[PDB]
Swiss-Prot record, chains A, B:
The record marks 111, 114 as: Hydrophobic membrane-disruption site (MDiS). The record marks 105, 108 as: Important residue of the cationic membrane-docking site (MDoS). Snake venom phospholipase A2 (PLA2) that lacks enzymatic activity. Is myotoxic and displays edema-inducing activity. Displays bactericidal activity and promotes the blockage of the neuromuscular contraction of the chick biventer cervicis muscle. Also disrupts artificial membranes, and provokes tissue damages characterized by edema, necrosis and inflammation. May act as pro-inflammatory mediators, inducing metalloproteinase and cytokine production from the inflammatory and satellite cells. Expressed by the venom gland. Keywords: Antibiotic, Antimicrobial, Disulfide bond, Myotoxin, Neurotoxin, Secreted, Toxin. The record marks 16, 19 as: Cationic membrane-docking site (MDoS). It comes from the Eukaryota. GO terms for biological process: arachidonate secretion; defense response to bacterium; lipid catabolic process; negative regulation of T cell proliferation; phospholipid metabolic process. This is Basic phospholipase A2 homolog BnSP-7. The keyword Disulfide bond applies. The keyword Cell division does not apply. The lineage of its organism: Eukaryota, Metazoa, Chordata, Craniata, Vertebrata. It comes from Bothrops pauloensis. One of its GO terms (cellular component) is extracellular region. One of its GO terms (molecular function) is calcium-dependent phospholipase A2 activity.
Length: 121, 121
């Protein structure tokens, strides 16, 4: 759920997750996808494409178990949908962290209605 | 559009509008309505009910004319829908300013999927 996703983001990046990523660019946080603005935004595009397969569960609301072990996100076993979900969230948290060096605060609260349409996943 | 709405909020409150109100509580900013958390949130509930009464124009995307005159938001004539839209936005900007005294940062990045359902407008 958003709770685990947020915690992962914090653990990896060290940043307040909703502040930095709850509304970033055309793809991070709320709403759907859009033409990406930059690498941070692309992480979120990938993230939301990863979610598409998860028709058996709810990426926003469904809780799942993971642990932080040796500064690594380790998804707990669960049902396949929640496990895959956890792995989508792990991957975006790592990607956002990896791309902190080009994070641009001008995109932090991007006006998403004006984004151009995303390519299909 | 979101441009005029944010400019009004800034002019009234003196605060970065998307930072303080782009995702506040269950009603401010993205997505629809929800059970309000406090008076600031209720301003946005009213705002979104106001938008439902509009007749063809788009509150997110449609531009309109207004001026800041003697520290008052003055809606231009525009056309009927845009004029009404402008008045919805003026009302919420004023309301958010009026309720700065109980603004609670804990609601700034509220996780909206977990909000309880709003009453009908």
């Amino acid at each position: 759920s958003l709770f685990e996703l947020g915690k992962m983001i914090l653990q990896e990046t060290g940043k307040n997750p909703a502040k930095s990523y709850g509304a970033y660019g055309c793809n991070c946080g709320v709403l759907g996808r859009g033409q990406p603005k930059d690498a941070t935004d692309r992480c979120c595009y990938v993230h939301k494409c990863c979610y598409k397969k998860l028709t058996g569960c709810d990426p926003k609301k469904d809780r799942y178990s993971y642990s932080w072990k040796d500064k690594t996100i380790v998804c707990g076993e669960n049902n396949p949908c929640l496990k895959e979900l956890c792995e989508c969230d792990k991957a975006v948290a790592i990607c956002l962290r990896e791309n902190l060096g080009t994070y641009n605060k001008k995109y932090r609260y991007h006006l998403k209605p004006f984004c151009k349409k995303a390519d299909p996943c």
